[PDB]
Amino acid sequence: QKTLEVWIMPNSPQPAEDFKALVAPFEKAHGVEVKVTVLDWGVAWTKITTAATSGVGPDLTQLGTTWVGAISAMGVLEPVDDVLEALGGEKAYLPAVWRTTRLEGARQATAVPWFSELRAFYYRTDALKAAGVNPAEMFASWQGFEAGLARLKASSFRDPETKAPLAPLCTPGKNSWDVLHNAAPWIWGAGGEIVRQAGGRWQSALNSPESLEGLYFFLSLAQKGYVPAESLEKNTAQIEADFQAGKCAVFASGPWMIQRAQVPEAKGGFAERTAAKNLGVAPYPAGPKGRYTFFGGSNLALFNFSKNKPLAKELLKYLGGPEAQVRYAQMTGMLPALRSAWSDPSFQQNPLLRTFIQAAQFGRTYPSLAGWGGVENLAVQHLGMAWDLVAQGRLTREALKDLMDKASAAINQALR
Template sequence: MSTTAQPQQDMKDILRPYLQANPSLRVNVTVLNWESAWARINAAAESGQGPDLLELGSTWVTAISAKGALEPVPSTVQGLVGGAKQFFPALWGSTHRLNDSQIYAIPWYAGARVAFYRSDLFQHAGIRPNEAFANWGSFKQAMQKLKGIKLDGKLVGAFGYPGKNDWDILHNLAPWIWNAGGDFLNADQTKAIINSPEAMQAIRYFKSFADEGIVPASALERDSAQIEAGFFKGEYAVIFSGPWVLKMLSTDKAKGGQRESVTARNFGVASYPAGIKGNQTFFSGSNLAVMKSSKNKEQAWKLLQFLVSREAQIKYSTLSGMLPARLDALDDPILQQMPHYADFIAQVKLGRHYPVLPAWGKLETVFRTHIAQAVSMKTNDGSDSNKLGALSLKRVLDQAANEADRILKENP
């Protein structure tokens, strides 16, 4: 899937040493965008006709393996790549289904989200970052203090996040829900609890920044990439995003980066502000798997081993900005050169993944659709409408839970 600026060319660069060592091998690469990839891969799984080796988002492995479309990873291959101990635990947990120890994929790269903030604006407003990101209360106070701040005579949005049309809206909300003590499913993953008081509290808190004008109304019409671009241009003091932002801020403008920008000289990273259940972040990534329909399984397993090797993962990380999935690659000097890389890695330890069950792909669509509807509702316009807004929000979340429960019953 498209994760780098030139995915076709970048894959050629990654594969070059492997193909030089295997001159008789030909590798055809097909690049998909994330928005259409699920439908394409799902169709391939249904038809039994697909590529030898494919990338799967970490939330997709269980659904595709449940269709019988993936070849189990041989124990010999698992041993050759280092096994579970060599990868982030949260990402290794996505390589198999709940209550099933059979491994169907190997982690390729990882990603997590943290807060990026303008250190110069925080200093100008007299805000200490360690205090601002301590908890929900201190974060709200800091954002209120930043509201109306100007940079070079231009108004800066205190906080920037995208609105209902953003593909990543569920990922944006998940840490807030978890940190409030809420979740998407109950402990045994048999019932949806997205309509719990804790989840509702988190969504209302998240929405309050837009309702109070701390998040500019214009931001809600943007997607994640546009919010990140706005941060680079000095339009927002705080955003929450992934390691690719570090990559952009350490890459020369001539190569499409932002290293010469004012933001690159004045930024820091921090964890999500803590709720009553801590300050976890959303942790995800991608895995590589071999399809059962492959006519070239031996070559596919060898290619997979190369792609998840330490050297190949470091190369991919330098091109994409994503984190290596391998723990032994995290401290590579090339990656350590990025400003605040070590700070980012410290936050990754707080990462949490979605549930690993076959129905998650359908559930994610339901949750994303209804959360997009929820965040677009107005609920803070005074006491009467606030009560009405809370009831409307509850109805939306109840509907999401009901639809999710039906999916869980159909896909036990």
Template sequence: MQRSRRPFINWLTLLTLISMILVACGGAETAPTATTAPAATATTAAQVEPTTAATAETAATTEPATAEPVAGEVTLKLWHMPNGAAPADAIQAEIDAFEKANPGINVEPEMLDWGAAFQRIQTSVQGGEGPCLTQLGTTWNPTFAAMGGLRPFTAEEITAMGGSDSFVAASWATSQLQGMEGTFSIPWFADVRALAYRKDLLEKAGLKPEDAFKDWASFKTTLATIQEQNPDVAGIAFPGRNDWNVWQNSSMWIWNSGGDLLSSDLSEATFNSDAAVTGVSEFANLYSSKLTVTNTLELNSAQVDASFGDGRTFSAITGPWLISNARTAADAGGWANRTVADNLAYAEFPAGPGGSYTFVGGSNLAILKSCENAEAAVKFVQFLAGNESQLRYSQAIGMLPATKTAQADASIANDPLYSVFISAAAKGKTSAPIAEWGQVESVLNEQLGSLWDDVATAGGPVSAEVVKTRLDQAAQTVNELLGN
């Protein structure tokens, strides 16, 4: 399909809806180490098709601000979010290591709450005042790049970090802006989703992971078997509408059914296709099949993680941050239920007719165009993208490194828990690098949230027609946003 020509973005609409954009891949309510930001549509780096020149409709520019040589003492202000259980300590460890290796460059961190960060960055971009460096949720990059507020990284600067191929493909895609040349941020860490489960209960059932989680049918059989053998343990927990991950969790069922969120040219919604309806219906009816904790539709992600850690559920849709909960002693803040802690295991998502994919989000690092010490800022970003920092910081906050080299390190690659996420990330999908994504996400979340209300009141399996109606309503609004 030929991509329709449309205004690059309706700024009045965007500014009106900005307050609606939630922090998706993480947020203020997350478990101690669940920190990320909006992200997900079946998009890879190959789908980002930059043009050779900006159009008059685009506020962004591909020319980086002139970087003055670092001379004397310079101070870089960094905005970051509460990543991990001890966010201030985690980022300070990186700052200390960087400053030791780069005398004369000082980094001054300021931690922003996830709920306020988007507005703070927007105000800074619009007013020309703010930090030199800021953390961005992966789906924020297109919006701020389109506003012209981010300094693109040069080819030479990216080469010094190992080049684009050194980053996980799904993560690298989040640094781009559809229709524009340039890399507007650098992947910092990756949030990857998988299925956490109790290996002791699986062994008790006489099942092997490769069979238990092979596909949708075997997965549901496994959940039913576990519940039958362990009456006090529910098969699975996942959040309902009271969460920032509503569309992200549903997206994995859409992808695995053979569907997608947007068309290949990112011009129209496809999350209401027959395949997508099948995937969302399959997900929704885990609840009607009584394979979940009874209150799962009322939970947010942090509460889902807690129900798993307490031993109330056999499995949960979650991320790598649970590893630190399990490996930390109870008296140091780890899980009190040591049986669960000792038996934590992960599996990739059960395959559907379209394959097995997972959501990849995380956070990027961006330099604001107003930064007066751009060369020093680039050095700090390059340091944070280096192997040593990638390994140290990602493990401190309970996420995955964004670079392939760090992920291949034996400390992660040979770890039976982290290795599942590395394998899943290679098949990960993420959000579309379009300036309108924040609005698309908001619309999709609204209708998927309402669908969970339908599920709760259905009294049985929710019909494909009900799912189709919700997704059609979202698609109509999204297509209008995309100029169709």
């Protein structure tokens, strides 16, 4: 009785049940049972690295694209060049999705692209209308973005449900990997980066002039009262919930919210809510050095201590392939990792998703480095402490620089 075990993060409103629906046609063809376990994003790094060093865990795990090099360099993943060749090799993926299949500079791929995800701004159509904000100008530039938040702060608009005003902007300040992913575009927009390569060695560029200019611009949005104090102690899920509840006019997120907007509360969505009926999407605004957003998603890896590798490689080919690529993106509201799958009507004929599709031009990835998991832990801890400077009214350019100096020294040790 052939059995496979898969670890996933919560990609859909009913994560286990949807994934069971996705693999149902593969279970039927092979007479295999695919058992699924769901790990919260917060604990996923801990549980996946523990499986890696202990030698016990699933056949397959979901991996964030930014983690693939890091888990690969622990030497615990199976080569999957065979699976990727069978899915159509380098040509079948965006160059950026292809780079997340391997540790940077490795002979062999160690992960199969599963779904893509990039970031854009959800806004309340009713709130921006009542505030006199033209979205096309609010989302064009840093100048316009600040100008829209300031109109939204001063607006008399109140939510038809809460009978309370809306925070112009909510973003997470603690615990989530997004504390890093929400800062990345502001950093890139000012011409900076998280890391840079000098003499073949990567190092922190979080304390570079350009990185500090973008981070400072982002944090100073909270300084001016556009992000409420309470938001800076919250994690991604809580900010999502506050947008859904109609407490926030604007927030950065992935294409999945479009799907949740169509599905009732009882099935893990917010179709009942005022926000679901007053939903707009806009790209990140251009910085001084132009337009960028975070491009990520999740791949699938096979642990090299798996006992079911030929069968697990069949599951990878199936999950990586057109039918399952379309189906899971429909269930999750993600984009397919397989580029050919973007032409399916559920993505092309989806108006809010169109913004996410167009935003792929300006999408940017972290290099796929060995220490990258420790970089995200240190960046999240130290960016958390940078939001604290605003909550304490201690935000200065020199206090940010000091903070990022400490982060950079730590990130330089982690990168080796």
